Amino acid sequence: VKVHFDQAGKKVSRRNARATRAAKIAPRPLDLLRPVVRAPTVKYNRKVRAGRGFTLAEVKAAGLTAAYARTIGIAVDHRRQNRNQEIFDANVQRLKEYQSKIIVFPRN
Amino acid sequence: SYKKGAASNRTKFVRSLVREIAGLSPYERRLIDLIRNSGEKRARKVAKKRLGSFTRAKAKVEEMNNIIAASRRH
Amino acid sequence: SVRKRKMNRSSVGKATRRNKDKQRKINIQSNPIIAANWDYSLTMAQNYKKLGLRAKLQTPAGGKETEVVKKLEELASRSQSEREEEWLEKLYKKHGDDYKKMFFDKKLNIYQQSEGDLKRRLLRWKKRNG
Amino acid sequence: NNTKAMKHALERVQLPWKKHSFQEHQSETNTDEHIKDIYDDTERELAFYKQSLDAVLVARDEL
Amino acid sequence: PYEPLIDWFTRHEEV
Amino acid sequence: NKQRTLLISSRGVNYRHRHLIQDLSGLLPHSRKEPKLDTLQQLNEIAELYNCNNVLFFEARKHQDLYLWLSKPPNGPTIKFYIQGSRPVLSFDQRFESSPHYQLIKELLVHNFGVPPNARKSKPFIDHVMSFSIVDDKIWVRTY
Amino acid sequence: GAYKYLEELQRKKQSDVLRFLQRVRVWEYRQKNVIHRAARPTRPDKARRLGYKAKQGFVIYRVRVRRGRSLRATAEERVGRRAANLRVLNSYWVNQDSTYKYFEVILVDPQHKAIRRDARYNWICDPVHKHREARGLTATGKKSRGINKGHKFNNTKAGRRKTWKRQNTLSLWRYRK
Amino acid sequence: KVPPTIAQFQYTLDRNTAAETFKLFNKYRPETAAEKKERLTKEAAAVAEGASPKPYAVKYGLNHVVALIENKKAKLVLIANDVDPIELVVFLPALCKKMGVPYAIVKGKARLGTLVNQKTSAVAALTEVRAEDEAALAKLVSTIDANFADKYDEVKKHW
RNA sequence: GUUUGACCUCAAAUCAGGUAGGAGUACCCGCUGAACUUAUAUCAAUAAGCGGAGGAAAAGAAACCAACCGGGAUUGCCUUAGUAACGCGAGUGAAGCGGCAAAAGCUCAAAUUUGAAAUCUGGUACCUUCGGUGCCCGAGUUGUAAUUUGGAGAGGG
RNA sequence: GUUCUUUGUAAAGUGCCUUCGAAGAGUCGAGUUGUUUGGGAAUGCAGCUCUAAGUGGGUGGUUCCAUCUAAAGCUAA
RNA sequence: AUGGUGAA
């Protein structure tokens, strides 16, 4: 029998790890930018949830390439395809907003 | 489809050269002997027994017939 | 634990370590501006909100320009080799500006470069010379 | 399903059973739709056994 | 069993 | 009276279909046993290699359902089924003479299951009996 | 590329040329010991695609195992046990006999400085990769464990032992659900 | 016995033809490590204080030679008759015949390696030759053809 | 040339530079594995035994899940669910979808650098020594150096 | 931050126009004999007779369509 | 049952 006596301890450890990551990663928001995805299986066909990464077509339409996008904390999915032209538009708008809201420091 | 691709005739050339140089397997030899003496009706049964798939047996029979045509007609 | 009992009994001495306090105490070391403005008393999310920098791009789970201008303030804040320059000088005072003729210059154009590359290199050399 | 095409195809599927002796055929008068308790199967099994016995009694002495 | 090889493929040179 | 049939099945057979096919093959000496087939005109072409004017193909689709195909290879129709070498005895219900479809399926079952008296693996005597009857718009058959 | 020709030729294993080569090479191997050093692989086409590199630090071994645990796994374990200092990378079939089956195994010496300084191959030097064949981390070992993506391996996706612990453990929280 | 493809080798050129071929090949020995290094150092020294034509050398790499063949660029190909992985060279003669590139089988891989500053060379082929040896190259090609294809026309037969 | 040297193979060195044994073993990765206990099922892919490393191990970026307006590495929790399914009794017993924690993708094989094996192990002299340069020798052409893994990719303007 | 070096017709990224454009075999699979699951399509694993193609092959639902590209490997959370 | 010990 296993009892999770470290629930509070696990939460504290996760919070400390997140704080350490933020300290190491000060300017970036501790994560990348995820797209908007519609869930399958009918029962959830009317539900929209965050996805893994934007498709290559979405990144290209956003005005930047995938290789450079990955360095700006934008998740890119090379296996996800676009078939409905409303989630694609929403993702393009989200990427444009992210590009407008980002400030990039110079290399030197 | 985005990566089905085609032979490009290089795989065709290499496969033809390999088929010529390697020769014929004993089961292939028996298949061609049956074709040249019995016919497809008898060769296809043996091909299916050796392979187990009807489509594969038919493909092998067609390949053997093509090889025989290219050989005896030259 | 047999080993623990022996170590406690032994006079060698436990290699005592104390780092529990430093687990909670974290120092920001990825930016000078943020370090001078970061408040360790407030949480990571609280500090991010105070400085105006977004903490999580996605919607956070569960319930819930003062300094950003500094970053923008700092945001707003090649040469040709001697052999290449000599070769471009030969191209210049052998053909001048006729890149079409230079394209067929076997003696000087050892590498059969395109007209565009030759013209770009000539313009770059001229920008640094007369 | 259409009876026309099925009826036309049925002719080519029927062998000349009655044109020859029944001995080679080696193959009852009840629709069995009157059987009740179609879920317990107690009556259905009895009806099937009765049909089999009727067929056996007809095909027995022919040997 | 033992027969000479045939040049059905190698008979014609590759132009 | 003589006919030859073909027996085949889909890919994947373990607990029940294995026995339900082995018993059928044993009961049908005139039938031909062949390995699994891929899912559909190749069955008729295969039938030409054994002079068998009949095919008993089992298809297992939907990850849970079982299907059976009975058809005449050369020019006859086909019927799909979904109901879940000693000489046998077959009896048939009167309902098979009502509608053309019932008569057609009855004739197909007769000339596809009834082992001919003379065959390369036939037997002279009988050992068991079986009955064919249609009820609730479906056919019920068991080996007893 | 000559590798395409060799790969195509190897397909016709029943051809007269390959049939004769099989008997000649099996007769040659039977004279030698069960496990012996091989100067170079007899199937370069397979070895090259299996990570083989013609450079110092790469060792190819030939091992003999009686015909009927997979034979490839047994051969890999046998070669690894004798060559403790070596690390097993992969293996492939070369020849067979009525009484024995022959496989060629490729091993990499992590001690060699060439492998250590090679980024593409220095990962093998990690101690976690010690005796890969023993734990079934090789291509044959992974296949024997049924670790693959699909419903075909759902019941054995992550081994046949952790499932018992997962199903036999009663999970309880501080606040019972 | 052996299949027709095997025993095709060992029917090498005669003494005179092989000697002439090796004599011709010895005039195009690729620069060794020391020769190339000294040439590069001399060039660097000249550049330090302040247009050559295409170099001519014998192409010998098995992969490189196979790439040269099937493109009709190669003119003469030399094949070793003592390659331990025979499968690496079984297809070379037939491929050359199909492509029409003249080819010959010489005795010993070490002999091929010696003329290319290598311990063992599986194959040795010539792509481009100097105008002086062009007539010699054509004469050697004709002699090799006469002595191999016609003299050993049955090399691909009689197991 | 009745003769020399190469390629290949096989052996010796108290030669130089290297590594494996064993212990420990709660967790992991494979082989092997019974009975008490309960009406092939079940204790049980458990106990014990054997082999292999670590601070975690395995797995990991689909020949995946799905039939939807499609999702997009693996991993662990809740849920799906004590449901499907099996046994049709006793009982055994999952997985997609959904929410959460964390998110990083890449490295080879395969098409010629051929206008230059450009790669690297080892010995030696120095220096700014978890290494760097010059020289020497050897490994390599039966393939070490550039690029590419369909998300393509490559030669030219 | 402080700097000493940069190096060379050196390397990389984007759009357009032209020409090319290569994918893992005693392997899948079938057959047969044992093991595994409560798994009905013993899938998965184990011995062995046999053993294929590249507009191909695997996985599925329907008379066509949906997804992927196995027989190589690394990766912290 | 598993793993070991001794022995006119």
DSSP string for residues in C26-56: ----S-HHHHHH--SSS-HHHHHHHHT--S-
Q: Which residue of D has its CA nearest to F73?
A: D13
Whether the CB of A87 is less than 7 Å away from nucleic strand I comes out as yes
Main-chain phi, psi angles of F55, to 5 degrees: -140, 135
Chain C contacts to H (CB-CB under 8 A): 83, 107, 110
Residue at minimal CA–C1' distance from I120?
G114
Structure tokens at C56: 């999580």
Q: HEC string of G72-130?
A: HHHHHHHHHHHCCCCEEEEEEEEEECCCEEEEEEEEECCCCHHHHCCCCCHHHHCHHHC
Structure tokens at B62: 């067609």
| Residue H136, CA atoms < 13 Å, CB-side half-sphere | 15
What is the experimental resolution, given in Å to one decimal place? 3.5
Bridge partners of F80, per DSSP, are F69
Structure tokens at H1: 């016995």
CATH architecture for segment(s) G1-177: 3-Layer(aba) Sandwich (3.40)
Alpha helices in chain C (DSSP H): 2-9, 20-24, 32-37, 44-51, 68-76, 82-95, 99-103, 115-127
Residue C72 · residue A103 · CB < 8 Å? yes
Longest dimension (CA), chain B: 45
Chain A / chain C CB contacts < 8 angstroms = 58
Position of tokens 């009694």?
D57
Residue G88 · residue G133 · CB < 8 Å? yes
Position of tokens 């599986």?
H122
Residue H48: how many CB atoms within 10 A of its CB? 7
A78 vs A59: CA distance, rounded Å: 11
Chain B nearest CA to F59, separation (Å): 17
Q: How far is CA H72 from the centre of its chain?
A: 14
Q: Does B44 touch chain F (CB under 8 A)?
A: yes
Parse chain G into domains and list their residue ranges: 1-177
A48-50 and A36-38 strand pairing: antiparallel
Q: How far is CA C81 from the centre of its chain?
A: 26
Q: Which residue of G has its CA nearest to A3?
A: G172
Structure tokens at H60: 């010998």
Q: How far is the CA of A41 from the C1' of I67 (A)?
A: 9
Q: How far is CA F49 from the centre of its chain?
A: 19
- At B31 the three-state DSSP class reads helix
Main-chain phi, psi angles of H124, to 5 degrees: -145, 125
Q: State the amino acid at position C46 in one-letter form.
A: Q
H96 vs H70: CA distance, rounded Å: 8
Bridge partners of G66, per DSSP, are G100
F103 vs F94: CA distance, rounded Å: 10
- At G24 the three-state DSSP class reads helix
Q: Which residue of C has its CA nearest to H49?
A: C83
Query: Which of G4, G5, G12 has the highest number of chain B CBs within 10 A, making it the mutation to test binding with B?
Result: G12
Whether the CB of G153 is less than 7 Å away from nucleic strand I comes out as no
Q: Return the exposure string of A20-46: e unless at least 16 CB atoms fall within 10 Å of the residue's CB, then b.
A: eebbeebebbbebbbbbbeeeeeeeee
G87 vs G125: CA distance, rounded Å: 9
Whether the CB of H88 is less than 7 Å away from nucleic strand I comes out as yes
A53 vs A60: CA distance, rounded Å: 13
A67, A45, A46, A48: which is closest to A56 by C-alpha? A67
Structure tokens at G133: 């064949």
Structure tokens at A88: 């694609």
H125 vs H144: CA distance, rounded Å: 14
Position of tokens 């002595």?
H147
First vs last Cα of chain A: how many Å apart?
Answer: 56
Give the CATH number of the domain where residue H136 resides.
Answer: 3.30.1330.30
Structure tokens at C60: 């956070």
F5-9 and F31-33 strand pairing: parallel
C47 vs C40: CA distance, rounded Å: 8
Instruction: Look up the CATH number of domain B1-74.
Output: 1.10.10.1760
B17 vs G5: CA distance, rounded Å: 9
Structure tokens at B52: 């187990």
Residue F56 · residue F31 · CB < 8 Å? yes
Structure tokens at F82: 């979904």
Bridge partners of F9, per DSSP, are F58
Give me the sign of the Cα torsion angle H115, H118, H121, H123.
negative
Structure tokens at H135: 């007539």
Whether the CB of A28 is less than 7 Å away from nucleic strand I comes out as no
Chain H nearest CA to B56, separation (Å): 27
Whether the CB of G31 is less than 7 Å away from nucleic strand I comes out as no
Residue G96: how many CB atoms within 10 A of its CB? 15
H72 torsion bin: left (phi>0), alpha (psi -120 to 50), beta (else):
left
Q: Do H1 and E4 touch (CB under 8 A)?
A: no
Residue A90 · residue A36 · CB < 8 Å? yes
Position of tokens 């005895």?
F89
- At F104 the three-state DSSP class reads helix
| Residue G23, CA atoms < 13 Å, CB-side half-sphere | 9
A91 vs A36: CA distance, rounded Å: 6
Contacts of D11 (CB under 8 A, 6+ apart): none
Q: Which residue of C has its CA nearest to H48?
A: C83
Residue D62 · residue D22 · CB < 8 Å? yes
- At E7 the three-state DSSP class reads coil
C80, C82, C90, C127: which is closest to C110 by C-alpha? C90
Considering all nucleic acid strands, name the nucleotide whose C1' atom is nearest to the C-alpha of residue G113. Answer: I121
G171 vs G86: CA distance, rounded Å: 43
H6 vs H25: CA distance, rounded Å: 27
Task: Report the structure determination method.
Answer: cryo-EM
F43 vs F36: CA distance, rounded Å: 11
Burial bucket for residue H22 (CB in 10 Å: 0-12, 13-18, 19+): middle
Structure tokens at C106: 């076997």
Which strands, in side-by-side order, build the sheet including G100-108?
G35-38, G58-66, G100-108, G87-96
C-alpha dist (Å) from residue G150 to C2, G155, H104: 48, 10, 53
| Residue A82, CA atoms < 13 Å, CB-side half-sphere | 20
Return the DSSP state at F128.
Answer: E
C115 vs C101: CA distance, rounded Å: 9
Structure tokens at G134: 């023993």
Report residues 55-94 of G contacting strand I, contact meaning Cβ closer than 7 Å.
55-56, 69, 73, 84-85
- At H106 the three-state DSSP class reads strand
Q: Return the exposure string of G60-90: e unless at least 16 CB atoms fall within 10 Å of the residue's CB, then b.
A: bbbbbbeeeeebbbbbbbbbbeebeebbbbb
C-alpha angle B11-B13-B14 in degrees, rounded to nearest 5: 65
Chain C / chain H CB contacts < 8 angstroms = 3
Q: How far is the CA of A37 from the C1' of I27 (A)?
A: 38
Structure tokens at F108: 């197909």
Parse chain D into domains and list their residue ranges: 1-63
Q: How far is CA G46 from the centre of its chain?
A: 12
G136 torsion bin: left (phi>0), alpha (psi -120 to 50), beta (else):
left
Q: Which residue of B has its CA nearest to E11?
A: B74
Q: What are the respective helix, strand and coil percentages of chain H, to the nearest 5?
A: 50, 10, 45
Give contacts of F48 with chain B, Cβ < 8 Å. Answer: 41
First vs last Cα of chain D: how many Å apart?
Answer: 41
G103, G101, G163: which is closest to G139 by C-alpha? G103
Contacts of C24 (CB under 8 A, 6+ apart): A16
C-alpha angle G13-G14-G17 in degrees, rounded to nearest 5: 80
Q: How far is the CA of F62 from the C1' of I83 (A)?
A: 19
**What kind and span of H or E run contains A49?**
strand A48-50
C-alpha dist (Å) from residue G38 to A22, G32, G77: 54, 11, 17
C44 vs C38: CA distance, rounded Å: 9
F30 vs F22: CA distance, rounded Å: 14
Q: Do F131 and D51 touch (CB under 8 A)?
A: yes
Structure tokens at G46: 């397979």
Chain G nearest CA to B44, separation (Å): 19
F134 vs F141: CA distance, rounded Å: 9
F1 vs D20: CA distance, rounded Å: 9
Helices (H) and strands (E) in chain H, counts: 6, 3
Return the DSSP state at G44.
Answer: H
- At G16 the three-state DSSP class reads helix
Residue G130 · residue G116 · CB < 8 Å? no
Return the DSSP state at F95.
Answer: G
Q: Return the exposure string of F99-125: e unless at least 16 CB atoms fall within 10 Å of the residue's CB, then b.
A: ebbebbbbbbbbbbbbbbeebeeeeee
Q: Do A29 and C57 touch (CB under 8 A)?
A: yes
Residue at minimal CA–C1' distance from I6?
H110
Return the DSSP state at A76.
Answer: B
Whether the CB of A79 is less than 7 Å away from nucleic strand I comes out as yes
Residue G134 · residue G144 · CB < 8 Å? no
H152 vs H149: CA distance, rounded Å: 5
Residue H72 · residue H46 · CB < 8 Å? no
H5 vs E3: CA distance, rounded Å: 11
Residue A48 · residue A36 · CB < 8 Å? yes
G35-38 and F138-140 strand pairing: unpaired
Give me the sign of the Cα torsion angle F42, F44, F47, F49.
negative
Q: State the amino acid at position A42 in one-letter form.
A: V
Residue at minimal CA–C1' distance from I55?
G128
C-alpha dist (Å) from residue H56 to B44, G8, H32, H127: 57, 34, 14, 9
Bridge partners of F87, per DSSP, are F126
Q: How far is CA F28 from the centre of its chain?
A: 9
Residue H81 · residue H9 · CB < 8 Å? yes
Residue F34: how many CB atoms within 10 A of its CB? 20
Parse chain B into domains and list their residue ranges: 1-74
Bridge partners of A54, per DSSP, are A76
G86 vs G108: CA distance, rounded Å: 6
Residue D2: how many CB atoms within 10 A of its CB? 9
Whether the CB of G176 is less than 7 Å away from nucleic strand I comes out as no
C-alpha dist (Å) from residue F75 to F8, F39, F107, H36: 20, 20, 16, 80
Q: How far is the CA of G154 from the C1' of I47 (A)?
A: 28
**What kind and span of H or E run contains F20?**
helix F17-27
- At G38 the three-state DSSP class reads strand
Angle between helices F100-113 and D3-13 (to 10 degrees): 30
Q: Which residue of H has its CA nearest to C86?
A: H50
G140 vs G72: CA distance, rounded Å: 7
Of A24, A29, A104, the CB nearest to C30: A24
Of A16, A24, A30, the CB nearest to C55: A30
Residue F15 · residue F41 · CB < 8 Å? no
Position of tokens 């187990």?
B52
A16 torsion bin: left (phi>0), alpha (psi -120 to 50), beta (else):
alpha
Residue G89 · residue G53 · CB < 8 Å? no
Q: How far is CA B48 from the centre of its chain?
A: 13
| DSSP string covering H46-69 | HHHH---------B--HHHHHHHT
Q: Return the exposure string of G3-19: e unless at least 16 CB atoms fall within 10 Å of the residue's CB, then b.
A: bebbbbbbebebbbbbb
| D with E: touching (≥3 Cβ pairs within 8 Å) | no
Whether the CB of C103 is less than 7 Å away from nucleic strand J comes out as no
Structure tokens at A27: 């300017």
